[PDB]
Write a structure and sequence with these properties.
heterodimer, A: 216 residues, Immunoglobulin-like, six-stranded mixed β-sheet, four-stranded antiparallel β-sheet, 4% helix, elongated, B: 234 residues, mainly beta, seven-stranded mixed β-sheet, five-stranded antiparallel β-sheet, 19 strands, 0% helix, immune system
Chain lengths: 216, 234
């Protein structure tokens, strides 16, 4: 028995200038003295926003406010600014240990759908001398974040031999970029001809394939 | 200016003991006078970690009285100590595994029910944070990266593959920082080999591929590895 926090939604997508409503629910009723909120941006420590009966911490502007009673608590950002897009955590602090955080809500910028530009890169001759082949597929400047990448090697669908990495939302155009890297040995790589990256994204009418033929 | 200096070894091997320390500056842990604001007995010196892909996990806290509170998920392993004469408090975690790879933050917790004159904002929260110690638990040896070109093919895209390095991080720039527009440096991934890998890409006009020079600058501080790699059409 302990106080468990659940935040909702997992991700919130809003435009600058809109009002954001973030929710945090405690498993038991808790005094509003002990409901704290934090902002967390990539590459930085979390920062306290609201605590002790919805009082703003030092340096926190007026558009951040808190409300709630019993089990359901709310962080409100009355008018979003570009710097307000980040991850937000609630925390129970002082009612009963452990003083655990909620799962956090990612507040991202909502923009119109943007299709990715797709590029495929063969392994360089230099890497092949190292005994390994990496094939890189680039999905550039797309929205929303959800995308599917399917590697095909001489029309054989691959699974479990590639890794993905996604950038943070771009501060200028609010898009995402994704890379998928297929890793094969030199010996395996030279057994096949056509290396293809198939991309599915809601901004694309049909899946888009980029490919090369090994050696050309 | 209360601030927290984070130190301690961040590169560990499995089964070893993590040992981190934060030094408090701008205030004294051994000052038992109280004439203004919040009593220094109302501070709770705390540890919070974030593993990759997870949220914040409150580890525990210690008061200058020596009383501790620990998260039940780690209570069987964790130890938190305080040394007021050195303005230090520390975190110890033995028998570490890859599940302990995380950024570890120390922070000042505040829980005041009385005060003198004024109560500064930040009560009942962690109002001051250290900027973290990245900790990696791995049997891998410190290794500089291998940098391979992602050559432009037949708006063009090109880049560099910064592969097989340990530990994190690496800094990547283009043309010594003269090229920033259109650059995407992806977050590294941990490969199944235990080494990290990332790519850095940039979109450029196709017409510039004959004239413009494209060089990616990679700096891996833990191995003192600096690589300038030229990327040109193949």
């Amino acid at each position: 028995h302990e106080i468990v926090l659940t935040q909702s939604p997992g991700t919130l997508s809003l435009s600058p200038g809109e009002r954001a409503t973030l929710s945090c629910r405690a498993s038991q009723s808790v005094s509003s003295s002990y409901l704290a909120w934090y902002q967390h941006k990539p590459g930085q420590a979390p920062r306290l926003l609201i605590s002790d009966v919805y009082r703003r911490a030092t340096g926190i502007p007026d558009r951040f406010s808190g409300s709630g009673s019993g089990t359901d608590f709310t962080l409100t950002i009355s008018r979003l600014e570009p710097e307000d897009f980040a991850v937000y955590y609630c925390q129970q602090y002082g009612s009963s240990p452990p003083y655990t955080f909620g799962q956090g809500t990612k507040l991202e910028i909502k923009r119109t759908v943007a299709a990715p530009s797709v590029f495929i890169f063969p392994p360089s001759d230099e890497q092949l001398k190292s005994g390994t082949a990496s094939v890189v597929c680039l999905l550039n400047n797309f929205y929303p974040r959800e995308a599917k990448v399917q590697w095909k090697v001489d029309n054989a669908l691959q699974s479990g031999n590639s890794q993905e990495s996604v950038t943070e939302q771009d501060s200028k155009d609010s898009t995402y970029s994704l890379s998928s890297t297929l890793t094969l040995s030199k010996a395996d790589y030279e057994k096949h001809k056509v290396y293809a990256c198939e991309v599915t994204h809601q901004g694309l009418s049909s899946p888009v394939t980029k490919s090369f033929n090994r050696g050309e | 200016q209360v601030q927290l200096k984070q130190w301690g070894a961040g590169l560990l091997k499995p089964s070893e003991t993590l040992s981190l320390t934060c030094t408090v500056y701008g205030d004294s842990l051994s000052d038992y006078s109280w004439s203004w604001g919040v009593s220094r007995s109302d501070y709770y010196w705390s540890w919070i970690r974030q593993p990759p892909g997870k949220g914040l996990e409150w580890i525990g806290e210690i008061n200058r009285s020596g009383s501790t509170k620990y998260n039940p998920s780690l209570k069987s392993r964790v130890s938190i100590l305080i040394e007021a004469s050195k303005n230090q408090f520390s975190l110890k975690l033995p028998s570490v595994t890859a599940a302990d790879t995380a950024v570890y933050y120390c922070a000042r917790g505040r829980r005041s029910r009385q005060w003198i004159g004024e109560l500064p904002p930040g009560n009942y929260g962690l109002d001051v944070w250290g900027q973290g110690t990245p900790v990696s638990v791995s049997s891998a040896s410190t290794k500089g990266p291998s940098v391979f070109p992602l050559a432009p093919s037949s708006t063009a895209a090109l880049g560099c593959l910064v592969k097989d390095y340990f530990p994190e991080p690496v800094t990547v720039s283009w043309n010594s920082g003269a090229l920033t527009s259109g650059v995407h440096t992806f977050p590294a991934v941990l490969q199944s080999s235990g080494l990290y890998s990332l790519s850095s890409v940039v979109t450029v006009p196709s017409s510039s591929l004959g004239t413009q020079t494209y060089i990616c600058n990679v700096n891996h501080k833990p191995s003192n590895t600096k690589v300038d790699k030229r990327v040109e059409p193949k």
